[PDB]
Design an enzyme around this catalytic site. Structure first.
Site, PDB file in Angstrom:
ATOM      1  N   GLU A 291    -102.419  29.292  -4.712  1.00  0.00           N
ATOM      2  CA  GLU A 291    -101.098  28.734  -4.507  1.00  0.00           C
ATOM      3  C   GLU A 291    -100.081  29.679  -3.909  1.00  0.00           C
ATOM      4  O   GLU A 291     -99.012  29.957  -4.472  1.00  0.00           O
ATOM      5  CB  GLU A 291    -100.595  28.182  -5.860  1.00  0.00           C
ATOM      6  CG  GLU A 291    -101.455  26.971  -6.149  1.00  0.00           C
ATOM      7  CD  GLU A 291    -101.203  26.419  -7.519  1.00  0.00           C
ATOM      8  OE1 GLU A 291    -101.151  27.077  -8.533  1.00  0.00           O
ATOM      9  OE2 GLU A 291    -101.121  25.119  -7.524  1.00  0.00           O
TER      10      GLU A 291
ATOM     11  N   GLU B 142    -110.212  23.380  -8.420  1.00  0.00           N
ATOM     12  CA  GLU B 142    -109.668  22.873  -9.667  1.00  0.00           C
ATOM     13  C   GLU B 142    -109.803  21.386  -9.691  1.00  0.00           C
ATOM     14  O   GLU B 142    -109.500  20.739  -8.700  1.00  0.00           O
ATOM     15  CB  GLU B 142    -108.186  23.181  -9.906  1.00  0.00           C
ATOM     16  CG  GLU B 142    -107.938  24.705  -9.697  1.00  0.00           C
ATOM     17  CD  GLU B 142    -106.542  25.217  -9.917  1.00  0.00           C
ATOM     18  OE1 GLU B 142    -106.204  26.370  -9.583  1.00  0.00           O
ATOM     19  OE2 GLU B 142    -105.774  24.326 -10.512  1.00  0.00           O
TER      20      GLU B 142
HETATM   21 MG   LIG Z   1     -99.484  27.907  -9.852  1.00  0.00          MG
END
Ligand SMILES: [Mg+2]
Ligand SMILES: [Mg+2]
Ligand SMILES: [Mg+2]
Ligand SMILES: [Mg+2]
Ligand code: NA
Ligand code: NA
Ligand code: NA
Ligand code: NA
Ligand code: NA
Lengths: 1011, 204
Positions: free
Chosen positions: A449, A525
């Site tokens: 991220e 994920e």
């Molecule tokens: Mg994060």
């Protein structure tokens, strides 16, 4: 200066990164991996003092200890000791976003240690210090003299103390900054802590030494031959008499060996590395390493004089395996993997971010016992021992750079900036230098991220260039950018597209075939396991098995990040975001684990275990076809147990040894089975049992199961007639029915069964009424907040439609006497502000036997949001010790999360019927139930149910499980229908349509009777 | 059909009949149908149907009731999916409205006769003085299923006496992925095991 506010300065005087060293001076000890006298642990009691900013630290601290310092155990996180609070922030940075600056109020940890150094270490060679992990930045002094600086909380920082030490007693002074420019790259979704949280050690090396070494294994086409190549570099006194010897052992057997002087091949016009050497060992029929069979060799690297003097020895475990992507598939030793993975943060409810061997081991055993074969290091390099453990126990690993800048706007703001390239590169390069020899690491990851910036492209390439043996993956910027060899989305759904702009999350099956796409897809994920979740999990496993290029994923995540708190009475309790006065915070968003913080499983764990099974089964007549999904092993520790039961009553059973080759099949014909005659459903259950214990499991462990309904014998048998007829008595306010020692009372004003007596004992605390809501799950709530309502969340849709506040209006209530029974008929409407949301019509038929048959028909307005459930509820007066049922179980199971449950006769203690998720919600359901026994009551039908000491109302209004209080009696929820729980993600609606109660009209029936 | 039970009771304002029947074959119970008939002072007949289907029997083509009406009327009027024939797995093009057609348009003359002419999602059906209400699928024509299944060419079919009415709580999809292997999708198979439907027959 202020080096902690300059991305340009990430260390001062730090030693180069390298694989794990011990500097053994005896090769047999190296070989055995026994401890090294040259490698000392400096863990234990240190002295510690907290300051609110570095400017507050007194200069004396450097020369001597502080009277006020406390004595504390190192490694540790100061927050864990109460010095300041841990912070639970998800995406938003715990500090004001203004890179590269930090708050002038920056908690400072002053650690210190007086320790001893043997004269001998000082008479020759080099003595260095190693900090395995210091969060977030720190200065170092030895004996009052400044040694250096370091950043990157998750990799070792090594300093040469050779010139600072003196025989005997020495003193370290470590000034640790909680916040630094490094923080801008450490925005992972977890508790924000600080301190010397990994091991501290002291290492002795000789002056002429092994400075690094890389081990590689290349194979012939069928893997029957391999070449082990070890590149060794040295530092120090370079002379002709030097040699390197690499030997490979299999147990006590030396399988190969090579010796060579230093001086590598010519590489350019200026020559070659006269300080390097490449040794190449041929190995025939190598035992291959895999998560299935973690075959290891041991390589010992000896630095020595040609005449025989060993200078020092270094060494590592070696797993012969090849990792490559070919034709769009990720292959391990030539075979395509199916990653049964999990994301795992380093977290302990008492120690915080400090890891210990016991914990690691415990996670590993649990993971393996639950059919996981891979782990992703979300989102930073782990404690070194982790790797050793995955190498030995066998788990494929995704090693990830400690780079996460999610809080930026846009997310690639820093990673696309060349000025952050240096800081990023260190995070990537030093990770690879340290972990490149571990066979368990099969994929490198660039961080998490942080959007997609040119810095990522550059580092992707650097890795590909220095380590061609492992693909490189990176989800940022859309999961399929040019900085990833694998499509590795987070939370992409199986069939449903989510076309966000710029970074859409396509259905995974669709993603694979976009024009020009060819990479494999492994979700970095998926299946957000927050609270009561993992609904839709099987939908993922089915796609993975069906599509070759869908090669699996890593569940988010292994363990809840809850922290232990102690009450007024010193009783521990699980705390989450905001429980330490931390604000802002992301409340319970820190708990998304398959297991609780103490390692106790959540019910979802079992659903993961089953979908991740390694044996698949098909049933044909009386034949069972077993199919192995192992790629490399034979089922050499497996037998098959089968058993047939008629509605829970065992009829036949047996065992058959399982002998299936990897990817093979075995047919198993069952013995003639029972032909009953007696009503009920016959069910066949098979289990795969491990007769012998393993390194990671106990004898008898069950690794797989499956069930099938065989023949069904519908009951056509009419019940015997009753020497009784119930009597009805009436009043304006009620209808009362009596039959023997049994009585039922219906309130004519409310329209509900208001009371029942068995004997003379009242059976209810609250009347039996319909119920269309649930104490919302974390998935029902998503990110909705009091202050920040998310209107699209389920809970909000239901609140706004008035589901939680609807009042039942009586439309009708009648009583009729039949030939052998009394019949009560009712109709109710639920409205809100003028809107009829639901209509419930029922019949209650009490007959001469004492049973009460309840028939319910509900209508739901098509324009109202689909309700959470359609059922009845009531508080029973009774509190029984046990619950017996014929249905799915034994664990909690929901419509979209019940494949693992098995249909049988289960019997548990009350308390096991409640699931103590940290943040309270609807919980404990068991679906597909045909009969339920509790105290004197028995209920029969086709339903889902829940039973416990807590009302839906109570669950809904309480925030933490430790605040829950058992109510008088038992609350029972019996539903004809219940909505799916979702879980694809925990912040947008995720219940698949087929699990939504959208039929309009629902019908269900129960018989309530007594035993 | 084997009768397992047939009772009658009088309610305050109504008469209630209860029935139970088992369908067996060579000693196996295939289906069990439990019904209630409530006739009230309004003259409406409310039918409630609860059906059980043995798990090990193949999923049935349908789950409904049927009869041959004495009457033959010119038109068929319903409030449901239409106007043309439609089935569970082949009903996207049909629209929910009030349709009215000659009885013949309710029969589809496939060359090779079979079950045909169903309309799903119907809340109200009108034929002659009769009216049925609920949530069901139906077909109505001059040919029994029996005749259709026994006839190989449509030209050999002949109008039977009256009108055959098939009213389904549930109907199996028709498939067509291919016509040489089972092609009906799982979500279109009547595999629930227990089925409930209700209908009101009355006069209009
Ligand atoms: Mg994060
Ligand atoms: Mg700096
Ligand atoms: Mg000496
Ligand atoms: Mg030797
Ligand atoms: Na696959
Ligand atoms: Na989280
Ligand atoms: Na075996
Ligand atoms: Na709650
Ligand atoms: Na035919």
């Amino acid at each position: 200066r202020r080096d902690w506010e300059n991305p340009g300065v990430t260390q001062l005087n730090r030693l180069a990164a390298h694989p794990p060293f011990a500097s053994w001076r005896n090769s047999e000890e190296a070989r055995t991996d026994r401890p090294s006298q040259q490698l000392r642990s400096l863990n234990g009691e240190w002295r510690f003092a907290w300051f609110p900013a570095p400017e507050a630290v007194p200069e004396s601290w450097l020369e001597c200890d502080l009277p006020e310092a406390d004595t504390v155990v190192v490694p540790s996180n100061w927050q864990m000791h109460g010095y300041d609070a841990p912070i639970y922030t998800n995406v938003t940075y715990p500090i004001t976003v203004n890179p590269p600056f930090v708050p002038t109020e920056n908690p400072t940890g002053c650690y210190s240690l007086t320790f001893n150094v043997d004269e001998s270490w000082l008479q020759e060679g080099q003595t260095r210090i190693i900090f395995d992990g210091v969060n977030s930045a720190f200065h170092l002094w030895c004996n009052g003299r400044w040694v250096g600086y370091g950043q990157d909380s998750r990799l070792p920082s090594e300093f040469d103390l050779s010139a600072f030490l003196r025989a005997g007693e020495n003193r370290l002074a470590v000034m640790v900054l909680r916040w630094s420019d490094g923080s801008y790259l450490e925005d992972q979704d977890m508790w924000r802590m600080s301190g010397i949280f990994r091991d501290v050690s002291l290492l002795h090396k000789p002056t002429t030494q092994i400075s690094d070494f890389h081990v590689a294994t290349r194979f012939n086409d069928d893997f029957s031959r391999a070449v082990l190549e070890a590149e060794v570099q040295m530092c120090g006194e370079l002379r002709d008499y030097l040699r390197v010897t690499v030997s490979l052992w299999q147990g006590e057997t030396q399988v190969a060996s090579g010796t060579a002087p230093f001086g590598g091949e010519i590489i350019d016009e200026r020559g070659g590395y006269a300080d390097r050497v490449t040794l190449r060992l041929n190995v025939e029929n190598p035992k291959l390493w895999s998560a299935e069979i973690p075959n290891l060799y041991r390589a010992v690297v000896e630095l020595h004089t040609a005449d025989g003097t060993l200078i020092e020895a270094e060494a590592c475990d070696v797993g012969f395996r090849e990792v490559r992507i070919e034709n769009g598939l990720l292959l391990l030793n030539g075979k395509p993997l199916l990653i049964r993975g999990v994301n795992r943060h380093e977290h302990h409810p008492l120690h915080g971010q400090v890891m210990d061997e016991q914990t690691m081991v415990q996670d590993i055993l649990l993971m393996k016992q639950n059919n996981f074969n891979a782990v992703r290091c979300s989102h930073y390099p782990n404690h070194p021992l982790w790797y050793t453990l995955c190498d030995r126990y066998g788990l494929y690993v995704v090693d990830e750079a400690n780079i996460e800048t999610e809080g930026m706007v846009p997310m690639n703001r820093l990673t696309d900036d060349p000025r952050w390239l240096p800081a990023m590169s260190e995070r990537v390069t030093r990770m690879v230098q340290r972990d490149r020899n571990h066979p368990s690491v099969i994929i490198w990851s660039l961080g998490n991220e942080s959007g997609h910036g040119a810095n990522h492209d550059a580092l992707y390439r650097w890795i590909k260039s220095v380590d061609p043996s492992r693909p490189v993956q990176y989800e940022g910027g859309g999961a399929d950018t040019t900085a990833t060899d694998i499509i590795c989305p987070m939370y992409a759904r199986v069939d449903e597209d989510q076309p966000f702009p710029a970074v859409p999350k396509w259905s995974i099956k669709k993603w694979l075939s976009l024009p020009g796409e060819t990479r494999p897809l492994i979700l970095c994920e998926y299946a957000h396991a927050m609270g009561n979740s993992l609904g839709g999990f099987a939908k993922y496993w089915q796609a993975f098995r069906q599509y070759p290029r869908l090669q699996g994923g890593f569940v988010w995540d292994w363990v809840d990040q809850s922290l232990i708190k102690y009450d007024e009475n010193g009783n521990p309790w699980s705390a989450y975001g905001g429980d330490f006065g931390d604000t802002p915070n992301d409340r319970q968003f820190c708990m998304n684990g398959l297991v609780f913080a103490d390692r106790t499983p959540h019910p979802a764990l079992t659903e993961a275990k089953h979908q991740q099974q390694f044996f698949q089964f098909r049933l044909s007549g009386q034949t069972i076809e077993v199919t192995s999904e192992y790629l490399f092993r034979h089922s050499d520790n497996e037998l098959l147990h089968w058993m047939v039961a008629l509605d829970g009553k065992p009829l036949a059973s047996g065992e058959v040894p399982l002998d299936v080759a990897p990817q093979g099949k075995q047919l198993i014909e069952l013995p003639e089975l029972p032909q009953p005659e007696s009503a009920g459903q016959l069910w066949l259950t098979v289990r795969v049992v491990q007769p012998n214990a393993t390194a990671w499991s106990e004898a008898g462990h069950i690794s797989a199961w499956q069930q099938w309904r065989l023949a069904e014998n519908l009951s056509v048998t009419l019940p015997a007639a009753s020497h009784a007829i119930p009597h009805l008595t009436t009043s304006e306010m009620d209808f009362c029915i009596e039959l023997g020692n049994k009585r039922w009372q219906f309130n004519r004003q409310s329209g509900f069964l208001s009371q029942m007596w068995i004997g003379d004992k009242k059976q209810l605390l609250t009347p039996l009424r319909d119920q269309f809501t649930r104490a919302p799950l974390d998935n029902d709530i998503g990110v909705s907040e009091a202050t920040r309502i998310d209107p699209n969340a389920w809970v909000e849709r239901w609140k706004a439609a008035g589901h939680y506040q609807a009042e039942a209006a009586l439309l009708q209530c009648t009583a009729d006497t039949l030939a052998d029974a009394v019949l009560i008929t009712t109709a109710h409407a639920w409205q809100h502000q003028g809107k009829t949301l639901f209509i419930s019509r029922k019949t209650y038929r009490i007959d001469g036997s004492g049973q009460m048959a309840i028939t319910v028909d509900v209508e739901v307005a098509s324009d109202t949001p689909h309700p959470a459930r359609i059922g009845l509820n009531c508080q029973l007066a009774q509190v029984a010790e046990r619950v017996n049922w014929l249905g799915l179980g034994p664990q909690e199971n929901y419509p979209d999360r019940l494949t693992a449950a098995c249909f049988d006769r289960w019997d548990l203690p009350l308390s096991d019927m409640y699931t103590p998720y940290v943040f309270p919600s609807e919980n404990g359901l068991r679906c597909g139930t045909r009969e339920l026994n509790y105290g004197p009551h028995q209920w029969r039908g086709d339903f889902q149910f829940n039973i416990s000491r807590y009302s839906q109302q109570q669950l809904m209004e309480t925030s933490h499980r430790h605040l829950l209080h058992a109510e008088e009696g038992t609350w029972l929820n019996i539903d004809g229908f219940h909505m799916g729980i979702g879980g694809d993600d925990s912040w947008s609606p995720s219940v698949s349509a087929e699990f939504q109660l959208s039929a309009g009209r629902y019908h269900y029936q129960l018989v309530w009777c007594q035993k």
